[PDB]
């Protein structure tokens, strides 16, 4: 970190200085520096929370990111990794409670089965699969369900986008 003007230790403008174990923010970009005053360029844990700093410019990742073909969400403000349900760019992604990788396929959360594709939530749903073939409805007609939740929906005629998906009382296609 080459600090402008007289930031610390009466440095010359543009000179690298001692800057250890603290978060730095310039131009809306966050960095973390080790004890040797060098910005770390990998997954790190500081305040019992894990951040991802890029290996090419050492800036803290923000928003949605694809790392090793795994989708993560980092807080746009504090750069902390996100977990659970997070709505970014008009889509409600879900990330692991422990590992933070976004789910894919048909998965069960909160005792409710959800369907995800390309590490992203699908709103239309009505796909297939073991313990699947259900209504992953956006509509909250079933006890104010969350987006992409399975609905029993009983045996009534129904359509989503011109496609007919008449079901039974046991939530089966």
UniProtKB/TrEMBL annotation:
Cell wall-binding repeats lie at residues 40-59, 82-101. It is found in: Host cell membrane; Host cytoplasm, Host cytosol; Host endosome membrane; Secreted. It comes from the Bacteria. Belongs to the clostridial glucosylating toxin (LCGT) family. This is Toxin A. It comes from Clostridioides difficile. The chain holds residues 1904 to 2076 of 2710 of the full protein.
């Amino acid at each position: 970190y080459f600090a402008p003007a007289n930031t610390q230790n009466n440095n010359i403008e543009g000179q690298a200085i001692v800057y250890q174990s603290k978060f730095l923010t310039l131009n809306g970009k966050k960095y973390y520096f080790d004890n040797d005053s060098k910005a770390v360029t990998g997954w790190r844990i500081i305040n019992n929370e894990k951040y991802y700093f890029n290996p090419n410019n050492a800036i803290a990742a923000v928003g949605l990111q694809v790392i090793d073909n795994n989708k993560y969400y980092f807080n746009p403000d504090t750069a902390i990794i996100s977990k659970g349900w997070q709505t970014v760019n008009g889509s409600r992604y879900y990330f692991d409670t422990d590992t933070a990788i976004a789910f894919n396929g048909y998965k069960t959360i909160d005792g409710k089965h959800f369907y995800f594709d390309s590490d992203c939530v699908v709103k239309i749903g009505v796909f297939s699969g073991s313990n699947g073939f259900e209504y992953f409805a956006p509509a909250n007609t079933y006890n104010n369900n969350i987006e992409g939740q399975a609905i029993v929906y009983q045996s009534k005629f129904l359509t989503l986008n011109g496609k007919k998906y008449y079901f039974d009382n046991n939530s089966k296609a």
